[PDB]
Ligand binder design. Structure first.
Ligand code: 2AN
Ligand code: 2AN
Ligand code: 2AN
Ligand code: 2AN
Ligand code: 2AN
Length: 152
């Protein structure tokens, strides 16, 4: 089953700085800022579309990973589209979740435009708990980096 959500939020950080921290320096900063995430390793490609990253994390003493695949990336338009799937750490009811993110200038800061598509196994509805967990983690990473950028 396919479940789509669209959201907008704002940041006081201007788009080039926010894009650089979250997308270009994200693989270095995320493990430093999020206790559970141990590493983000490129397993295929060189940072362009098709690049696959292995994200390893620890929870309740156990180690697992998921795969992050770049669908599109363009620095000039602050565009970053990526898919989370597979590995040993992914939500059981999900085949994949695809993200389309875009920043634009707003009021000295950034407007953030997101489109999120959950692909559930078979014809399963998206449980509230799975929506909530993917959203909290997505927000957590983005907002940990944003706070870091504000501190510097
Ligand atoms: O929980 S997931 O829904 O995959 C998830 C969804 C959205 C963003 C995520 C970012 C990093 C790690 C995740 N999970 C993860 C879990 C265990 C080990 C490694 C990564 C993320
Ligand atoms: O949502 S339901 O209407 O039961 C449902 C309806 C139709 C197909 C479903 C397939 C898998 C899991 C479900 N439920 C489920 C229940 C608890 C937790 C996670 C998924 C499905
Ligand atoms: O939560 S939001 O404020 O849009 C948000 C804020 C900042 C960064 C985000 C990155 C990915 C998805 C989001 N939203 C999202 C929406 C539904 C499900 C999962 C994530 C992000
Ligand atoms: O902790 S929980 O709400 O369970 C939580 C569980 C899973 C993912 C989370 C992502 C961001 C923030 C949380 N809360 C949080 C609460 C206090 C300080 C920092 C983060 C998340
Ligand atoms: O991760 S902390 O452990 O604080 C940390 C530890 C050691 C050095 C740090 C340098 C800059 C920012 C941090 N964190 C940070 C995160 C969000 C907002 C402001 C600062 C640093």
């Amino acid at each position: 089953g396919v479940h789509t959500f669209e959201e907008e939020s704002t940041s006081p950080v201007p788009p080039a700085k926010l894009f650089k921290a979250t997308v270009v320096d994200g693989d270095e900063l995320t493990p430093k800022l999020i206790p559970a995430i141990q590493s983000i390793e490129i397993v295929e490609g060189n940072g362009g579309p098709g690049t696959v990253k292995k994200v390893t994390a620890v929870e309740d003493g156990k180690t697992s990973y998921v795969l992050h695949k770049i669908d599109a990336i363009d620095e000039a338009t602050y565009t970053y589209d990526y898919t989370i799937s597979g590995g040993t750490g992914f939500q059981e009811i999900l085949e994949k979740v695809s993200f389309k993110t875009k920043l634009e200038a707003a009021d000295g800061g950034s407007k953030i435009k997101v489109s999120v598509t959950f692909h559930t196994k078979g014809d399963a509805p998206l449980p509230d708990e799975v929506h909530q967990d993917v959203k909290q983690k997505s927000q957590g990473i983005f907002k940990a980096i944003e706070g870091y950028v504000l501190s510097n």
